[PDB]
Amino acid sequence: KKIEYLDKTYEVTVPTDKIAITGSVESMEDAKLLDVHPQGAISFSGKFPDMFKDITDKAEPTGEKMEPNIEKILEMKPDVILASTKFPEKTLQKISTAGTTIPVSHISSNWKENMMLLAQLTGKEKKAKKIIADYEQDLKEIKTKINDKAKDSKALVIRIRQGNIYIYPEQVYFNSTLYGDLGLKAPNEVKAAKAQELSSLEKLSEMNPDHIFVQFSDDENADKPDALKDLEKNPIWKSLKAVKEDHVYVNSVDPLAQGGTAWSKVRFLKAAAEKLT
Protein backbone atom coordinates (compact mmCIF):
# COMPACT_ATOMS: atom_id res chain seq x y z
CA LYS A 1 0.00 0.00 0.00
CA LYS A 2 1.16 3.51 -0.87
CA ILE A 3 1.68 5.81 2.10
CA GLU A 4 1.95 9.58 1.70
CA TYR A 5 3.91 11.17 4.53
CA LEU A 6 5.07 14.80 4.50
CA ASP A 7 4.82 14.92 0.70
CA LYS A 8 6.79 11.74 0.09
CA THR A 9 5.58 8.32 -1.04
CA TYR A 10 6.41 5.10 0.82
CA GLU A 11 5.36 1.57 -0.07
CA VAL A 12 4.69 -0.68 2.91
CA THR A 13 3.06 -3.97 3.88
CA VAL A 14 -0.03 -2.96 5.88
CA PRO A 15 -1.61 -3.30 8.25
CA THR A 16 1.54 -4.40 10.07
CA ASP A 17 2.96 -4.95 13.55
CA LYS A 18 6.51 -5.66 12.39
CA ILE A 19 7.37 -2.03 13.06
CA ALA A 20 10.81 -1.06 14.30
CA ILE A 21 10.99 2.29 16.07
CA THR A 22 14.41 3.92 16.31
CA GLY A 23 15.25 7.51 17.27
CA SER A 24 11.62 8.58 16.89
CA VAL A 25 10.42 9.12 20.45
CA GLU A 26 7.38 10.77 18.88
CA SER A 27 6.44 7.40 17.39
CA MET A 28 6.90 5.73 20.79
CA GLU A 29 4.39 8.11 22.35
CA ASP A 30 1.99 7.80 19.40
CA ALA A 31 2.23 4.04 19.94
CA LYS A 32 1.11 4.56 23.55
CA LEU A 33 -1.94 6.56 22.49
CA LEU A 34 -2.85 4.21 19.62
CA ASP A 35 -2.07 1.07 21.63
CA VAL A 36 0.41 -0.16 19.01
CA HIS A 37 2.88 -2.84 20.08
CA PRO A 38 6.02 -2.52 17.87
CA GLN A 39 8.53 -5.29 17.24
CA GLY A 40 11.44 -2.91 17.78
CA ALA A 41 11.54 0.01 20.24
CA ILE A 42 13.93 2.61 21.61
CA SER A 43 15.88 1.73 24.74
CA PHE A 44 16.77 4.41 27.27
CA SER A 45 19.95 3.68 29.20
CA GLY A 46 19.81 0.02 28.23
CA LYS A 47 16.17 -0.54 29.21
CA PHE A 48 12.53 0.39 28.54
CA PRO A 49 11.14 3.08 30.94
CA ASP A 50 8.10 2.18 33.06
CA MET A 51 6.23 4.75 30.96
CA PHE A 52 6.79 2.66 27.81
CA LYS A 53 6.52 -0.90 29.16
CA ASP A 54 2.88 -0.79 28.13
CA ILE A 55 3.88 -0.74 24.43
CA THR A 56 7.20 -2.63 24.50
CA ASP A 57 5.72 -5.91 25.80
CA LYS A 58 6.48 -7.55 22.44
CA ALA A 59 9.53 -5.51 21.52
CA GLU A 60 13.29 -5.90 21.26
CA PRO A 61 15.72 -2.95 21.66
CA THR A 62 16.62 -1.03 18.50
CA GLY A 63 19.30 0.94 20.28
CA GLU A 64 19.50 4.24 22.13
CA LYS A 65 17.45 7.25 20.99
CA MET A 66 20.33 8.55 18.86
CA GLU A 67 22.38 5.41 18.22
CA PRO A 68 20.30 3.16 15.96
CA ASN A 69 21.59 -0.40 16.29
CA ILE A 70 21.73 -1.57 12.67
CA GLU A 71 22.60 -5.18 13.45
CA LYS A 72 19.59 -5.54 15.72
CA ILE A 73 17.24 -3.83 13.28
CA LEU A 74 18.54 -6.01 10.44
CA GLU A 75 17.88 -9.13 12.52
CA MET A 76 14.24 -8.11 13.07
CA LYS A 77 13.47 -7.99 9.34
CA PRO A 78 10.68 -5.45 10.01
CA ASP A 79 8.10 -4.47 7.41
CA VAL A 80 8.86 -0.85 8.21
CA ILE A 81 11.32 1.21 10.20
CA LEU A 82 10.15 4.43 11.80
CA ALA A 83 13.28 6.54 12.02
CA SER A 84 13.71 10.23 12.78
CA THR A 85 14.54 13.44 10.94
CA LYS A 86 17.17 13.96 13.63
CA PHE A 87 19.36 11.33 11.93
CA PRO A 88 21.72 12.57 9.22
CA GLU A 89 21.19 11.30 5.66
CA LYS A 90 24.14 8.94 6.01
CA THR A 91 22.64 7.27 9.08
CA LEU A 92 19.20 7.03 7.43
CA GLN A 93 20.82 5.47 4.34
CA LYS A 94 22.45 2.82 6.52
CA ILE A 95 19.17 2.08 8.30
CA SER A 96 17.53 1.74 4.88
CA THR A 97 19.51 -1.42 4.10
CA ALA A 98 17.39 -3.15 6.74
CA GLY A 99 14.00 -2.22 5.31
CA THR A 100 11.59 0.49 4.21
CA THR A 101 12.59 3.48 6.33
CA ILE A 102 10.42 6.48 7.14
CA PRO A 103 12.02 9.48 8.89
CA VAL A 104 9.34 10.63 11.31
CA SER A 105 9.38 14.41 11.73
CA HIS A 106 10.62 15.73 15.08
CA ILE A 107 8.78 19.02 14.51
CA SER A 108 5.91 19.57 16.96
CA SER A 109 3.58 21.11 14.37
CA ASN A 110 3.64 17.75 12.54
CA TRP A 111 2.08 15.85 15.46
CA LYS A 112 -1.17 15.06 13.64
CA GLU A 113 0.71 13.73 10.60
CA ASN A 114 3.08 11.59 12.68
CA MET A 115 0.00 10.20 14.40
CA MET A 116 -1.79 9.44 11.13
CA LEU A 117 1.33 7.79 9.71
CA LEU A 118 1.44 5.24 12.52
CA ALA A 119 -2.32 4.75 12.25
CA GLN A 120 -2.03 4.09 8.49
CA LEU A 121 0.66 1.46 9.11
CA THR A 122 -1.41 -0.30 11.78
CA GLY A 123 -4.87 0.08 10.26
CA LYS A 124 -6.12 2.43 12.98
CA GLU A 125 -7.11 5.52 11.00
CA LYS A 126 -10.53 5.69 12.67
CA LYS A 127 -9.00 5.53 16.15
CA ALA A 128 -6.44 8.15 15.14
CA LYS A 129 -9.02 10.51 13.60
CA LYS A 130 -11.19 10.37 16.73
CA ILE A 131 -8.30 11.26 19.04
CA ILE A 132 -7.35 14.22 16.88
CA ALA A 133 -10.96 15.39 16.57
CA ASP A 134 -11.48 15.15 20.34
CA TYR A 135 -8.32 17.12 21.05
CA GLU A 136 -9.36 19.97 18.77
CA GLN A 137 -12.88 20.01 20.23
CA ASP A 138 -11.65 19.81 23.83
CA LEU A 139 -9.11 22.53 23.00
CA LYS A 140 -11.85 24.79 21.65
CA GLU A 141 -14.04 24.05 24.68
CA ILE A 142 -11.25 24.74 27.18
CA LYS A 143 -10.41 28.03 25.47
CA THR A 144 -14.01 29.28 25.57
CA LYS A 145 -14.21 28.82 29.32
CA ILE A 146 -10.79 30.04 30.39
CA ASN A 147 -11.38 33.50 31.83
CA ASP A 148 -9.32 36.45 30.59
CA LYS A 149 -7.41 36.57 33.87
CA ALA A 150 -5.78 33.26 32.93
CA LYS A 151 -5.61 33.90 29.18
CA ASP A 152 -3.64 37.12 29.64
CA SER A 153 -1.54 35.64 32.45
CA LYS A 154 2.16 34.79 32.33
CA ALA A 155 2.64 31.01 32.29
CA LEU A 156 5.97 29.22 32.16
CA VAL A 157 7.13 25.64 31.74
CA ILE A 158 10.45 24.61 33.25
CA ARG A 159 12.14 21.24 33.40
CA ILE A 160 14.80 20.33 35.94
CA ARG A 161 17.66 18.25 34.58
CA GLN A 162 20.90 17.37 36.36
CA GLY A 163 19.79 19.83 39.03
CA ASN A 164 19.61 22.66 36.50
CA ILE A 165 16.53 24.68 35.51
CA TYR A 166 15.75 24.73 31.78
CA ILE A 167 13.26 26.60 29.58
CA TYR A 168 12.42 25.92 25.95
CA PRO A 169 11.56 27.61 22.63
CA GLU A 170 7.99 28.78 22.04
CA GLN A 171 7.29 25.90 19.63
CA VAL A 172 9.08 23.20 21.62
CA TYR A 173 8.24 20.79 24.44
CA PHE A 174 4.92 21.63 26.12
CA ASN A 175 5.18 25.24 24.94
CA SER A 176 3.47 24.50 21.63
CA THR A 177 0.32 23.65 23.57
CA LEU A 178 0.58 26.31 26.27
CA TYR A 179 1.23 29.22 23.88
CA GLY A 180 0.59 27.76 20.43
CA ASP A 181 -2.78 26.13 21.07
CA LEU A 182 -4.11 27.66 24.30
CA GLY A 183 -2.97 31.07 23.12
CA LEU A 184 -1.21 32.36 26.23
CA LYS A 185 1.60 34.82 25.56
CA ALA A 186 5.15 33.46 25.56
CA PRO A 187 7.51 35.40 27.88
CA ASN A 188 10.41 37.16 26.15
CA GLU A 189 12.94 34.58 27.41
CA VAL A 190 11.01 31.74 25.80
CA LYS A 191 10.66 33.67 22.53
CA ALA A 192 14.42 34.27 22.42
CA ALA A 193 15.48 30.71 23.27
CA LYS A 194 16.70 28.66 20.29
CA ALA A 195 16.77 25.33 22.14
CA GLN A 196 16.76 23.94 25.67
CA GLU A 197 18.15 26.96 27.51
CA LEU A 198 19.67 27.19 31.00
CA SER A 199 17.81 29.51 33.36
CA SER A 200 17.77 30.17 37.10
CA LEU A 201 15.97 31.24 40.23
CA GLU A 202 17.21 34.75 39.43
CA LYS A 203 15.60 34.67 35.99
CA LEU A 204 12.47 33.01 37.34
CA SER A 205 12.27 35.79 39.92
CA GLU A 206 12.64 38.30 37.09
CA MET A 207 9.75 36.98 35.00
CA ASN A 208 7.76 36.23 38.16
CA PRO A 209 5.23 34.10 36.19
CA ASP A 210 1.64 33.69 37.35
CA HIS A 211 1.75 29.96 36.61
CA ILE A 212 4.73 27.61 36.58
CA PHE A 213 4.58 24.03 35.37
CA VAL A 214 7.62 22.23 36.74
CA GLN A 215 8.69 18.85 35.34
CA PHE A 216 11.11 16.78 37.42
CA SER A 217 12.13 13.21 36.65
CA ASP A 218 14.27 11.18 39.04
CA ASP A 219 16.13 9.39 36.26
CA GLU A 220 17.33 12.76 34.92
CA ASN A 221 18.52 13.95 38.33
CA ALA A 222 20.22 10.85 39.72
CA ASP A 223 23.14 12.76 41.17
CA LYS A 224 21.00 15.57 42.62
CA PRO A 225 17.63 14.19 43.75
CA ASP A 226 17.38 17.11 46.18
CA ALA A 227 17.56 19.77 43.44
CA LEU A 228 13.82 20.53 43.50
CA LYS A 229 13.42 20.38 47.29
CA ASP A 230 16.43 22.70 47.69
CA LEU A 231 14.76 25.06 45.23
CA GLU A 232 11.40 24.96 47.03
CA LYS A 233 13.07 25.83 50.36
CA ASN A 234 14.94 28.83 48.93
CA PRO A 235 13.56 32.16 50.24
CA ILE A 236 13.52 33.66 46.72
CA TRP A 237 11.37 30.82 45.41
CA LYS A 238 8.91 31.30 48.27
CA SER A 239 8.48 34.98 47.37
CA LEU A 240 7.66 34.21 43.73
CA LYS A 241 4.10 35.19 42.85
CA ALA A 242 3.30 31.73 41.49
CA VAL A 243 4.43 30.09 44.71
CA LYS A 244 2.49 32.47 46.95
CA GLU A 245 -0.67 31.87 44.92
CA ASP A 246 -0.06 28.12 44.94
CA HIS A 247 0.07 28.25 41.15
CA VAL A 248 3.07 25.91 40.82
CA TYR A 249 2.28 22.50 39.30
CA VAL A 250 4.96 19.83 39.58
CA ASN A 251 4.75 16.85 37.24
CA SER A 252 1.19 17.55 36.08
CA VAL A 253 2.23 15.20 33.29
CA ASP A 254 4.53 12.18 33.53
CA PRO A 255 7.97 13.86 33.84
CA LEU A 256 9.37 11.84 30.93
CA ALA A 257 6.74 12.95 28.42
CA GLN A 258 8.41 14.37 25.28
CA GLY A 259 6.15 17.40 25.20
CA GLY A 260 5.07 17.79 21.58
CA THR A 261 3.33 14.58 20.51
CA ALA A 262 -0.36 13.65 20.45
CA TRP A 263 0.15 11.85 23.78
CA SER A 264 1.97 14.77 25.45
CA LYS A 265 -0.46 17.36 24.09
CA VAL A 266 -3.55 15.41 25.14
CA ARG A 267 -2.12 14.99 28.64
CA PHE A 268 -0.93 18.58 28.99
CA LEU A 269 -4.25 19.98 27.76
CA LYS A 270 -6.16 18.18 30.53
CA ALA A 271 -3.58 19.22 33.12
CA ALA A 272 -3.73 22.81 31.91
CA ALA A 273 -7.51 22.63 31.97
CA GLU A 274 -7.51 21.36 35.55
CA LYS A 275 -5.30 24.28 36.64
CA LEU A 276 -6.29 27.27 34.50
CA THR A 277 -10.02 26.68 34.91
Burial environment of residue 60 by CB neighbours within 10 A (0 to 12, 13 to 18, 19 or more): middle
Domain with CATH 3.40.50.1980 in the chain: 1-123, 124-277
The reported resolution of this PDB entry, expressed in Å, is 2.2
The Cβ-side half-sphere exposure at 146, using a 13 Å CA radius, reads 23
CATH architecture of residue range(s) 1-123: 3-Layer(aba) Sandwich (3.40)
Is residue 227 within 8 A of residue 160, CB to CB? The reply is yes
Q: Does domain 124-277 bear CATH number 3.40.50.1980?
A: yes
Strand partners, 20: 40, 81
d(CA 270, CA 43): 28
Is residue 2 within 8 A of residue 237, CB to CB? The reply is no
Asked how this structure was determined, the answer is X-ray
Is residue 162 within 8 A of residue 223, CB to CB? The reply is yes
